[PDB]
Amino acid sequence: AELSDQEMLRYNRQIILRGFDFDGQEALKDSRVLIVGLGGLGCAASQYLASAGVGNLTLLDFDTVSLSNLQRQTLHSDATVGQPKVESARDALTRINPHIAITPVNALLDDAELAALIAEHDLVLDCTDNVAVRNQLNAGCFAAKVPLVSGAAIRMEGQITVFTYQDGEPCYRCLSRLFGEAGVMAPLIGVIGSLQAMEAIKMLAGYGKPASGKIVMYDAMTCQFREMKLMRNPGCEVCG
Amino acid sequence: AELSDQEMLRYNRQIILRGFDFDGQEALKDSRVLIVGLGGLGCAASQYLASAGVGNLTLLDFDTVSLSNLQRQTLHSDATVGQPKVESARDALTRINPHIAITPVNALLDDAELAALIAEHDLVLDCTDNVAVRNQLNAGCFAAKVPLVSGAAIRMEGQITVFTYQDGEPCYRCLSRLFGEAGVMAPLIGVIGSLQAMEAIKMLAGYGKPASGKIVMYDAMTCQFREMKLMRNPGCEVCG
Amino acid sequence: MIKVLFFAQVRELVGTDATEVAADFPTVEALRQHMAAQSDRWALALEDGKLLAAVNQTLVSFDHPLTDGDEVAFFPPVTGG
Amino acid sequence: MIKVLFFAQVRELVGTDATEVAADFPTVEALRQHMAAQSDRWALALEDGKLLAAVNQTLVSFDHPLTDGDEVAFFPPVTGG
Ligand SMILES: [Zn+2]
Ligand SMILES: [Zn+2]
């Protein structure tokens, strides 16, 4: 990529980070990221991916903005209640950073369509609300070896893990195999979403060390963070 | 406070949290919070305090929006470059939640003015950029016993601590006495700011346990969180 | 002793952040079933399928063995969301 | 041995996340001064006034004593900001 003079000034505070530099900012400009789910986590993650300069964002979600969403989905507003979340989010994100390209996809995609869509991106964010879509994304990401930055939140608890699909690394099924409406506190989505954005930037630019091979769990009631190692499960149906 | 039917539906996901309930949401509605500094941390914290339903926000900052801010201060936009940060933020926050009262104060206040301003609020957020203003706030908060939720970020490192000024608890000087431009990665502000908002909600509603007596440090390069105990320093000039 | 930690909703439902137990639990499953049968409330918090467990900071399956000195952390999975 | 951990910019400047040192350092200050004098780069990372230290997970002043077995964490303060 080539940054304009105006972009160099906009992204100054990132450019001057030692091991990030112009090359890191250019890496972001040249990146293509797929964000799946434009609810709480997706609004939080996308806002900082956009501000940070990630050049191409695809926004995927089938749902519309509802009054109850507005407690935590800060890209959406009372004026956009009833609109597809991807459109409401796109309009907000383009104001956050007019230099990037935002593609809204208002659809519920099947596996064949997801395979194509995943393969066309550098990195995928899982900001969805259910294990069915999350398993779908993990399967597609695993097959194409496209990193998945996975965030989840409910009540007062959040989690993040990055799946890079390197040999010997666990996938989402290695975790999901361990188990089988409710409230959520607004800023929890901000914490997890922002962590997702951070991990995505780190992966795109090759900056720092990704949060792979561990679950980072945030317990908001006591402001405690626990890192627990995640091992590959030998017979997991996806990567076993 | 009394929540309207429309507010009850907007705040549903918080209301249904067990030990939060209608009383917790009413506590937020009735709260008055002072946010000092409407740059990166302040934009991040204020957006979720507003969405969450904190009823009265005072926004304090003397500075104007600049092109370089837009990499991380997502309430501001290219259209508001040159405007006071408190005005740009107020206009954005009122769209996030039209039910709350936002008071912008575009000033650099002295200690006498701060004492009055602090005493008029239930809780203060330190989202400033320098130790001089931070020490100012700690001194005022200490004298009035008004909790201070303090966040800081630079490069790839963030910190949060809550000062409740209970007997035997450290204050900010107990920490600041341990020491005596640079870049910053955009989503780092999101993580810390959102934690600040969370801790503020917890204190206002009396929900969970505040992050007092410890520094929570986020090392974004390795996605590591370290909690380190903070003890009162015997002769600290403020609380010693 | 085995140190057993509870986080998030588990902790909020059972009323304690930590308890030391005798080392008479062969696996995480024995420990869980024992604790789950104390009350309906305990059975809800530790409901199979609605629970994760870490031993010495590693996520494990419930068939994992326990040994004196081990730290066991019980907490909920999240798909929020 | 004393375990010494480095975080954030400290780690990024010195090139290691951790190193075990002999227990010949009376205080955090002796440990810091010794490490700081290895190179200009080390002196920048551990510059007095631009450094925090935790011993066994408690923030301490640099006059705090060290003992064999102790874990010492060195990391920068932040006022960002
Ligand atoms: Zn797997
Ligand atoms: Zn003090």
XYZ file of C-alpha atoms and ligand atoms in Angstrom:
644
model
C 0.000 0.000 0.000
C 0.834 3.651 -0.245
C -0.332 5.980 2.526
C -1.303 9.525 1.599
C 0.072 12.494 3.467
C -3.313 12.916 5.114
C -3.424 9.253 6.146
C 0.136 9.487 7.570
C -0.994 12.337 9.799
C -4.246 10.581 10.775
C -2.372 7.413 11.742
C 0.592 9.146 13.361
C 0.122 7.608 16.797
C 0.309 4.099 15.338
C 3.055 4.827 12.835
C 5.394 6.036 15.596
C 5.107 2.751 17.502
C 8.531 1.295 17.107
C 8.035 -2.112 15.626
C 4.809 -1.158 13.880
C 5.941 1.740 11.672
C 4.835 2.682 8.225
C 4.978 -0.994 7.162
C 2.482 -1.955 9.850
C 0.112 0.809 8.877
C 0.436 -0.156 5.220
C -0.310 -3.745 6.198
C -3.556 -2.576 7.745
C -4.468 -0.477 4.685
C -3.966 -3.557 2.476
C -5.952 -5.895 4.756
C -9.329 -7.462 4.224
C -11.251 -8.474 7.344
C -14.602 -10.219 7.628
C -16.647 -9.261 10.717
C -19.477 -11.649 11.376
C -22.220 -10.272 13.615
C -22.781 -6.502 13.930
C -24.357 -6.550 17.368
C -22.517 -5.545 20.533
C -19.174 -7.206 19.979
C -19.236 -6.357 16.248
C -19.970 -2.667 16.805
C -17.182 -2.484 19.369
C -14.597 -4.324 17.264
C -15.459 -2.692 13.952
C -15.283 0.839 15.367
C -11.576 0.389 16.294
C -10.673 -1.655 13.206
C -12.073 1.229 11.139
C -10.404 3.975 13.204
C -7.138 2.080 13.169
C -7.111 2.008 9.348
C -7.972 -1.567 8.391
C -8.578 -0.910 4.717
C -11.348 -3.296 3.716
C -14.112 -4.431 6.045
C -16.854 -6.819 5.119
C -19.805 -6.756 7.496
C -21.949 -9.862 7.635
C -25.230 -10.179 9.528
C -28.843 -10.930 8.738
C -30.469 -9.082 11.673
C -32.107 -5.688 12.123
C -31.528 -3.059 14.773
C -33.966 -3.281 17.708
C -34.681 -0.960 20.652
C -33.083 -3.309 23.114
C -29.786 -3.335 21.172
C -29.191 0.310 21.799
C -28.105 -0.320 25.366
C -24.819 -1.722 23.964
C -24.529 -1.469 20.184
C -23.293 2.041 19.946
C -22.946 2.327 16.207
C -26.718 1.901 15.912
C -29.184 4.534 17.083
C -32.881 5.211 17.617
C -33.026 6.556 14.052
C -31.839 3.175 12.671
C -34.154 0.891 14.616
C -35.628 -1.443 11.987
C -32.705 -1.129 9.546
C -30.351 -4.037 8.780
C -27.507 -3.947 11.250
C -24.945 -4.067 8.433
C -26.318 -0.914 6.868
C -26.622 0.999 10.140
C -23.065 -0.058 11.033
C -21.632 0.792 7.607
C -23.050 4.307 7.787
C -21.520 4.847 11.196
C -18.149 3.314 10.315
C -17.728 5.360 7.180
C -17.967 8.481 9.380
C -15.354 7.063 11.749
C -12.896 6.642 8.887
C -13.729 7.819 5.360
C -10.589 6.281 3.895
C -11.649 2.659 4.179
C -13.871 0.400 2.104
C -16.896 -1.135 3.835
C -18.941 -3.878 2.268
C -22.262 -4.709 4.056
C -23.676 -8.195 3.392
C -27.210 -8.594 4.722
C -27.616 -12.325 4.464
C -27.527 -15.592 6.344
C -24.901 -17.568 4.423
C -24.547 -21.343 3.934
C -21.265 -23.252 4.092
C -20.461 -23.050 0.432
C -20.999 -19.310 0.419
C -18.952 -18.946 3.599
C -16.045 -20.880 2.214
C -15.756 -18.456 -0.639
C -16.262 -15.453 1.572
C -13.676 -16.583 4.170
C -11.097 -17.424 1.542
C -11.404 -13.894 0.169
C -10.240 -12.332 3.461
C -7.074 -12.181 5.482
C -8.722 -12.648 8.841
C -12.244 -13.331 10.232
C -13.823 -11.924 13.475
C -16.426 -14.073 15.173
C -18.764 -11.542 16.880
C -21.793 -13.754 16.660
C -24.233 -14.790 19.265
C -24.411 -18.583 18.985
C -22.442 -21.627 18.865
C -24.002 -22.769 15.517
C -22.614 -19.872 13.505
C -19.350 -19.910 15.526
C -18.842 -23.631 14.663
C -19.579 -22.772 11.024
C -16.883 -20.114 10.992
C -14.334 -22.302 12.733
C -14.909 -25.045 10.135
C -14.458 -22.666 7.263
C -11.474 -20.951 8.765
C -9.848 -24.282 9.588
C -10.214 -25.495 6.039
C -8.758 -22.349 4.458
C -6.245 -21.613 7.199
C -7.576 -18.105 7.697
C -7.229 -16.867 11.285
C -10.335 -16.494 13.394
C -10.437 -13.969 16.250
C -13.197 -15.196 18.446
C -14.883 -13.130 21.176
C -17.904 -13.928 23.339
C -19.822 -12.173 26.055
C -22.797 -12.699 28.332
C -23.877 -11.419 31.758
C -20.611 -10.234 33.340
C -18.240 -12.639 31.629
C -16.230 -12.384 28.410
C -13.765 -14.552 26.560
C -11.303 -14.189 23.722
C -9.177 -16.641 21.774
C -7.344 -16.400 18.482
C -7.276 -19.527 16.218
C -4.366 -19.372 13.727
C -4.786 -22.973 12.547
C -1.101 -23.767 12.770
C -0.145 -27.476 13.047
C -0.691 -28.653 16.647
C -2.908 -25.693 17.673
C -6.407 -26.147 18.946
C -9.442 -25.031 17.000
C -12.807 -23.813 18.330
C -14.196 -27.399 18.447
C -11.415 -28.418 20.731
C -13.109 -26.029 23.179
C -16.801 -26.365 22.117
C -16.610 -30.106 22.688
C -16.342 -29.287 26.414
C -19.937 -28.183 26.732
C -23.453 -27.946 25.363
C -32.709 -14.408 27.360
C -29.799 -13.794 29.708
C -28.583 -10.317 30.399
C -25.391 -8.561 29.433
C -23.792 -5.447 30.888
C -23.048 -2.799 28.179
C -19.304 -2.124 28.677
C -18.499 -5.826 28.711
C -19.006 -5.759 24.883
C -16.570 -2.844 24.699
C -13.869 -4.716 26.552
C -14.140 -7.918 24.501
C -14.782 -6.201 21.194
C -11.787 -3.929 21.641
C -9.608 -6.990 22.510
C -10.816 -8.593 19.296
C -9.812 -5.536 17.317
C -6.399 -5.512 19.026
C -5.739 -9.179 18.258
C -6.815 -8.629 14.630
C -4.406 -5.711 14.201
C -1.588 -7.730 15.742
C -2.241 -10.643 13.351
C -2.550 -8.438 10.246
C 0.615 -6.491 10.902
C 2.545 -9.365 12.491
C 3.000 -7.268 15.605
C 3.403 -8.892 19.003
C 2.172 -12.346 19.888
C -1.359 -13.535 19.198
C -3.627 -14.829 21.985
C -3.611 -18.343 20.486
C -3.517 -21.560 22.559
C -5.292 -19.924 25.496
C -8.707 -18.578 26.513
C -8.566 -15.169 28.071
C -11.520 -14.873 30.415
C -12.604 -11.561 31.863
C -14.711 -11.775 35.063
C -16.217 -8.351 35.235
C -17.842 -8.790 38.656
C -14.373 -8.925 40.333
C -12.295 -7.307 37.570
C -10.240 -10.513 37.242
C -8.617 -11.873 34.106
C -7.621 -15.507 33.878
C -5.590 -17.038 31.081
C -6.150 -20.767 30.726
C -4.178 -22.890 28.300
C -6.151 -24.488 25.511
C -4.771 -27.790 24.177
C -5.690 -29.532 20.955
C -8.203 -32.365 21.629
C -6.988 -35.580 19.917
C -10.269 -36.718 18.343
C -12.055 -33.336 17.924
C -14.206 -33.773 14.826
C -12.620 -30.802 13.092
C -8.841 -30.881 13.626
C -8.356 -34.254 15.300
C -35.621 7.291 39.868
C -38.528 6.109 37.809
C -37.833 4.342 34.515
C -40.268 4.854 31.655
C -41.690 1.941 29.736
C -39.431 2.860 26.837
C -36.365 3.003 29.089
C -37.263 -0.402 30.625
C -37.254 -1.917 27.150
C -34.043 -0.112 26.127
C -32.237 -1.326 29.250
C -33.724 -4.819 29.272
C -30.418 -6.658 28.988
C -29.103 -4.939 32.116
C -32.343 -5.079 34.071
C -32.510 -8.875 33.723
C -29.079 -9.335 35.311
C -29.920 -10.955 38.577
C -28.374 -8.797 41.224
C -28.599 -5.642 39.135
C -32.344 -5.427 38.439
C -34.554 -2.420 38.201
C -32.869 -0.922 41.296
C -29.478 -1.027 39.603
C -30.799 0.606 36.474
C -32.541 3.260 38.555
C -29.268 3.839 40.384
C -27.620 4.573 37.063
C -30.438 6.916 35.978
C -30.001 8.878 39.231
C -26.190 9.043 38.978
C -23.964 11.981 38.231
C -20.536 11.199 36.784
C -17.709 13.568 35.918
C -15.529 12.449 32.980
C -12.290 14.351 32.774
C -10.584 14.209 29.383
C -12.597 13.504 26.207
C -9.761 12.052 24.170
C -9.323 8.334 23.536
C -10.090 6.927 26.952
C -12.886 9.481 27.508
C -14.620 8.731 24.208
C -14.442 5.015 24.941
C -15.693 5.266 28.529
C -18.381 7.863 27.895
C -19.903 5.934 24.985
C -20.723 2.946 27.266
C -21.678 5.051 30.296
C -24.182 6.818 28.025
C -25.471 3.620 26.381
C -25.735 1.939 29.753
C -28.025 4.706 31.059
C -25.887 6.759 33.435
C -28.275 9.670 33.781
C -26.075 12.734 34.149
C -22.668 13.103 32.536
C -20.432 16.094 32.898
C -17.693 16.282 30.287
C -14.613 18.273 31.188
C -11.769 19.112 28.808
C -10.125 22.208 27.410
C -8.808 20.728 24.132
C -10.006 20.712 20.530
C -10.370 17.826 18.119
C -7.336 17.339 15.846
C -6.735 15.154 12.776
C -4.429 12.854 14.652
C -7.085 12.116 17.306
C -9.350 10.460 14.823
C -7.261 7.308 14.785
C -8.687 6.495 18.254
C -11.282 8.988 19.471
C -14.275 7.570 17.757
C -16.894 9.989 18.973
C -15.088 12.757 17.082
C -14.977 12.928 13.295
C -13.419 14.800 10.383
C -16.399 17.177 10.474
C -15.573 18.159 14.094
C -11.853 18.770 13.711
C -11.263 22.158 15.356
C -14.276 21.951 17.698
C -13.910 21.620 21.485
C -13.754 17.956 22.350
C -16.549 18.354 24.908
C -18.935 19.678 22.295
C -18.054 17.078 19.664
C -18.432 14.348 22.305
C -21.719 15.706 23.670
C -23.259 15.715 20.202
C -22.231 12.127 19.637
C -23.292 10.910 23.085
C -26.724 12.450 22.874
C -27.312 10.314 19.754
C -26.129 7.211 21.604
C -28.708 7.776 24.332
C -31.245 10.612 24.115
C -32.554 9.970 27.614
C -29.540 11.265 29.501
C -28.324 14.721 30.459
C -24.901 15.782 29.169
C -23.140 18.864 30.421
C -20.008 19.920 28.423
C -17.499 22.101 30.304
C -14.830 23.530 28.012
C -12.370 24.816 30.552
C -9.137 24.126 32.364
C -10.206 24.247 36.016
C -8.202 25.214 39.125
C -8.346 23.386 42.453
C -11.069 25.469 43.982
C -13.272 24.994 40.949
C -12.501 21.273 40.900
C -13.398 20.813 44.519
C -16.845 22.151 43.863
C -17.229 20.208 40.662
C -16.083 16.892 42.213
C -18.301 17.302 45.242
C -21.298 17.708 42.943
C -20.841 14.216 41.452
C -21.143 10.653 42.614
C -18.048 9.398 40.862
C -15.163 10.839 38.764
C -13.393 9.205 35.733
C -9.780 10.152 35.156
C -9.335 9.874 31.347
C -6.656 12.503 31.179
C -3.290 12.437 29.602
C -0.908 13.603 32.332
C 0.113 13.087 35.774
C -0.473 16.785 36.738
C -4.214 16.691 36.134
C -4.437 13.106 37.493
C -2.766 14.232 40.778
C -5.206 17.158 40.886
C -8.179 14.828 40.610
C -6.847 12.394 43.182
C -6.379 15.264 45.662
C -9.881 16.520 45.142
C -11.436 13.103 45.229
C -9.500 12.191 48.365
C -10.702 15.272 50.170
C -14.374 14.765 49.289
C -14.324 10.976 49.397
C -15.705 10.700 45.884
C -14.487 7.597 44.036
C -12.041 8.010 41.192
C -11.904 5.443 38.376
C -8.519 5.925 36.874
C -7.442 4.586 33.467
C -4.239 5.166 31.507
C -2.863 4.057 28.189
C 0.212 4.464 26.022
C 1.950 2.400 23.329
C 0.662 -1.141 23.944
C 0.117 -0.909 27.683
C -2.918 0.056 29.764
C -3.746 0.273 33.433
C -6.823 0.643 35.588
C -7.372 1.217 39.288
C -10.361 2.353 41.296
C -9.730 4.647 44.337
C -12.665 4.520 46.801
C -10.844 6.454 49.537
C -11.858 4.067 52.282
C -9.705 4.072 55.460
C -6.500 2.082 54.815
C -6.802 2.124 50.989
C -4.148 3.584 48.778
C -4.686 6.723 46.753
C -3.148 7.681 43.393
C -0.110 9.303 45.108
C 0.685 6.062 46.798
C 1.383 4.860 43.244
C 2.627 8.111 41.585
C 5.328 8.409 44.227
C 6.939 5.351 42.590
C 8.040 7.218 39.499
C 8.643 10.450 37.632
C 5.221 12.013 21.546
C 4.932 8.277 22.111
C 2.535 6.206 20.107
C -0.643 4.433 21.089
C -2.511 1.640 19.334
C -6.222 2.527 18.746
C -8.054 -0.426 20.373
C -5.984 -0.149 23.534
C -8.127 2.941 24.417
C -11.242 0.835 23.846
C -10.117 -1.851 26.246
C -9.154 0.527 29.066
C -11.995 2.959 28.503
C -14.560 0.174 28.533
C -13.022 -1.193 31.795
C -13.384 2.282 33.263
C -17.036 2.379 32.300
C -17.557 -1.090 33.805
C -15.932 -0.145 37.113
C -18.010 3.062 37.235
C -21.264 1.151 36.725
C -20.286 -1.352 39.403
C -19.546 1.457 41.891
C -22.732 3.416 41.111
C -25.035 0.442 41.413
C -23.068 -1.325 44.155
C -22.747 -4.348 41.904
C -19.803 -6.709 42.225
C -16.456 -5.776 43.692
C -14.503 -2.708 42.629
C -10.937 -2.959 41.283
C -9.564 -1.099 44.325
C -6.248 -1.943 46.042
C -4.725 -3.279 42.825
C -3.439 -2.091 39.443
C -4.777 -4.073 36.554
C -2.207 -3.912 33.783
C -2.996 -4.994 30.255
C 0.045 -5.892 28.091
C -1.402 -5.800 24.639
C 1.701 -7.120 22.860
C 1.239 -10.567 24.525
C -2.437 -10.281 25.512
C -1.477 -10.667 29.191
C -3.232 -9.149 32.180
C -1.452 -8.822 35.493
C -3.074 -7.777 38.743
C -0.606 -6.321 41.219
C -1.590 -5.375 44.744
C -1.352 -1.710 45.605
C -0.635 -0.907 49.269
C -1.043 2.417 51.015
C 2.351 4.200 51.321
C 2.856 5.366 54.945
C 4.126 8.900 54.283
C 2.474 9.613 50.881
C 1.847 13.357 50.893
C -1.862 12.915 50.268
C -3.196 10.083 52.450
C -0.198 9.308 54.647
C -5.784 -30.237 49.767
C -7.288 -29.372 46.390
C -7.941 -25.675 45.825
C -11.201 -25.141 43.950
C -11.905 -21.670 42.491
C -15.224 -20.447 41.158
C -15.600 -17.589 38.694
C -18.315 -15.535 37.063
C -21.872 -16.865 37.305
C -20.622 -20.077 39.033
C -19.284 -17.899 41.887
C -22.298 -15.686 41.948
C -24.664 -18.699 42.198
C -22.768 -20.650 44.861
C -21.679 -17.791 47.111
C -17.985 -18.447 47.406
C -14.943 -17.549 45.374
C -12.817 -20.404 46.697
C -12.813 -23.433 48.942
C -10.174 -25.970 49.894
C -11.403 -29.555 49.692
C -9.875 -32.842 50.838
C -8.046 -34.669 48.080
C -10.593 -37.493 47.779
C -11.686 -36.781 44.270
C -10.226 -39.018 41.627
C -11.292 -36.795 38.703
C -12.830 -33.451 37.974
C -16.080 -35.277 37.350
C -16.151 -36.736 40.948
C -15.482 -33.320 42.412
C -18.210 -31.737 40.275
C -20.872 -34.365 40.961
C -20.144 -34.173 44.689
C -20.473 -30.411 44.753
C -23.502 -30.358 42.396
C -25.626 -32.530 44.649
C -25.469 -30.131 47.668
C -28.487 -28.146 46.525
C -30.550 -27.355 43.450
C -28.719 -24.092 43.353
C -25.356 -25.896 43.313
C -26.645 -28.290 40.631
C -27.592 -25.322 38.463
C -24.182 -23.670 38.831
C -22.268 -26.848 38.010
C -24.678 -28.322 35.472
C -22.997 -30.670 33.072
C -22.947 -29.038 29.687
C -23.010 -25.570 31.224
C -19.577 -25.808 32.809
C -15.838 -25.469 32.040
C -12.988 -26.631 34.217
C -9.304 -25.721 34.333
C -6.698 -27.738 36.326
C -3.511 -25.897 37.126
C -4.386 -23.254 34.540
C -5.069 -25.755 31.659
C -8.544 -26.369 30.307
C -9.369 -30.028 30.710
C -12.143 -32.451 30.178
C -14.122 -33.656 33.220
C -12.387 -37.078 33.022
C -9.100 -35.427 33.918
C -7.499 -36.829 37.082
C -7.038 -34.769 40.205
C -4.100 -34.906 42.585
C -3.442 -33.440 45.981
C -2.143 -29.929 45.537
C -4.042 -29.336 42.287
C -5.924 -26.079 41.686
C -9.266 -26.567 39.958
C -11.181 -23.607 38.426
C -14.818 -23.932 37.512
C -16.444 -21.279 35.320
C -19.072 -20.978 32.635
C -18.562 -21.164 28.921
C -19.806 -18.213 26.917
C -21.221 -18.047 23.351
C -22.635 -14.464 23.798
C -23.128 -12.975 22.209
C 16.986 -18.241 42.135
C 15.048 -15.006 41.687
C 12.590 -14.997 38.794
C 12.576 -11.632 37.032
C 9.744 -10.892 34.561
C 9.639 -8.036 32.088
C 6.446 -6.643 30.587
C 5.344 -4.151 27.975
C 7.968 -1.709 26.696
C 10.547 -3.059 29.225
C 10.258 -6.485 27.536
C 10.217 -5.060 24.079
C 13.404 -3.025 24.742
C 15.438 -5.755 26.446
C 14.450 -8.734 24.308
C 13.386 -11.209 26.935
C 10.186 -11.921 28.793
C 11.891 -13.628 31.727
C 15.229 -14.580 33.196
C 16.268 -16.424 36.332
C 19.039 -14.675 38.248
C 21.187 -15.767 41.187
C 19.874 -14.553 44.517
C 22.684 -12.043 45.111
C 20.580 -8.947 45.067
C 19.769 -7.485 48.432
C 17.024 -5.167 47.121
C 15.096 -4.384 43.998
C 17.378 -1.404 43.546
C 20.551 -3.639 43.395
C 18.911 -5.899 40.853
C 17.813 -2.926 38.738
C 21.149 -1.101 38.800
C 22.962 -4.319 37.896
C 20.697 -4.992 34.949
C 20.599 -1.321 33.832
C 24.348 -1.083 33.384
C 24.549 -3.909 30.763
C 23.926 -1.557 27.859
C 22.473 1.839 27.028
C 19.458 -0.013 25.809
C 19.088 -1.774 29.175
C 19.600 1.545 30.994
C 16.775 3.071 28.970
C 14.378 0.211 29.728
C 15.085 0.268 33.461
C 15.592 4.008 33.885
C 14.903 5.175 37.386
C 11.758 7.231 37.331
C 10.460 5.383 34.282
C 10.025 2.050 36.030
C 7.644 0.094 38.307
C 8.436 -3.083 40.178
C 6.246 -5.772 41.721
C 7.594 -8.465 44.123
C 5.438 -11.533 44.468
C 2.537 -9.680 42.859
C 2.725 -6.588 45.189
C 3.875 -3.206 43.958
C 6.879 -2.142 45.977
C 9.391 0.593 46.217
C 12.922 -0.051 44.901
C 14.248 -0.275 48.500
C 12.229 -3.435 49.013
C 14.344 -6.459 49.977
C 14.692 -9.482 47.754
C 14.899 -13.091 48.869
C 15.712 -16.308 47.107
C 12.564 -17.618 45.497
C 11.060 -14.158 44.965
C 9.422 -13.223 41.655
C 10.201 -9.683 40.536
C 8.207 -7.985 37.722
C 9.509 -4.880 36.041
C 7.181 -2.824 33.840
C 6.541 0.768 32.894
C 4.172 3.167 34.541
C 1.592 4.771 32.296
C -0.045 8.240 32.469
C -1.468 8.038 28.869
C -3.183 9.178 28.005
Zn -10.011 -28.951 17.108
Zn -1.807 7.891 49.212
